[PDB]
Design a binder for this molecule. Structure first.
Ligand SMILES: [Ca+2]
Length: 223
């Protein structure tokens, strides 16, 4: 997160870190046994780390649970990042409490102008590299489909939206991928892609979660 703020420990209780020896992506806990993340975060050997603030210090609220199964969206295209969503089933159910909690799935899509909270352990510099140990947050609005398409000609599908600031300075970044965009208490996006980070006229591009709720629910029901 570039241009954000320190969230506060365990204030984003659905935020997970995906660990393969190191933090490599965010995710969102959607029930006791399932995480939503970005398909481009897929790898084998994932440990889901819940209840994290400092990802380098054991602070007392962590739950570390191995993935038992990963499911990349059937239609994920890694070239275009269309359908950049994956589900991860935990080997055991998380224990849910005030600091480790699921986030609601949308029943309807969000609209341009809605403010949302974007969070993660990604890069904090736009012309630099600095990875935080504690969770960072950014409040940002959803941008119009037309401004999103104008920023990224030929690249925005019906499964993507833009959020952030066209002026630059405030965005998600490398290492935030797979993490949440939460709007009015609903998971509306997944950190997906963008040209650089926090660049002028190059907002963040997010997977449009509301398009996937039917797939999410049926997948959970059969797995
Ligand atoms: Ca920790």
């Amino acid at each position: 997160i570039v241009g954000g703020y320190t969230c506060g420990a365990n204030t984003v209780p659905y935020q997970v870190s995906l660990n393969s020896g190191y933090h490599f992506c965010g995710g969102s806990l959607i029930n006791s046994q399932w995480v939503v993340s970005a398909a481009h975060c897929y790898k084998s050997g994932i440990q889901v780390r819940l209840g994290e603030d400092n990802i380098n210090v054991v602070e007392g609220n962590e739950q570390f649970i191995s993935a038992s199964k990963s499911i990349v969206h059937p239609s994920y295209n890694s070239n275009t990042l269309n359908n950049d969503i994956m589900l991860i089933k935990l080997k055991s159910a998380a224990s849910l409490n005030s600091r480790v909690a699921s986030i609601s799935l949308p029943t309807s899509c969000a609209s341009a102008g809605t403010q949302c909270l974007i969070s993660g352990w990604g890069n904090t510099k736009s012309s630099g590299t600095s990875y935080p140990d504690v969770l960072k947050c950014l409040k940002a609005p959803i941008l119009s489909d037309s401004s999103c398409k104008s920023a990224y000609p030929g690249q925005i599908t019906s499964n993507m939206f833009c959020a952030g600031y066209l002026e630059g300075g405030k965005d998600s970044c490398q290492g935030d991928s797979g993490g949440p965009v939460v709007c009015s208490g609903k998971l509306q996006g997944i950190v997906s892609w963008g040209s650089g980070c926090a660049q002028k006229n190059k907002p963040g591009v997010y997977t449009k979660v509301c398009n996937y709720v039917s797939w999410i629910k049926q997948t959970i029901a059969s797995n």
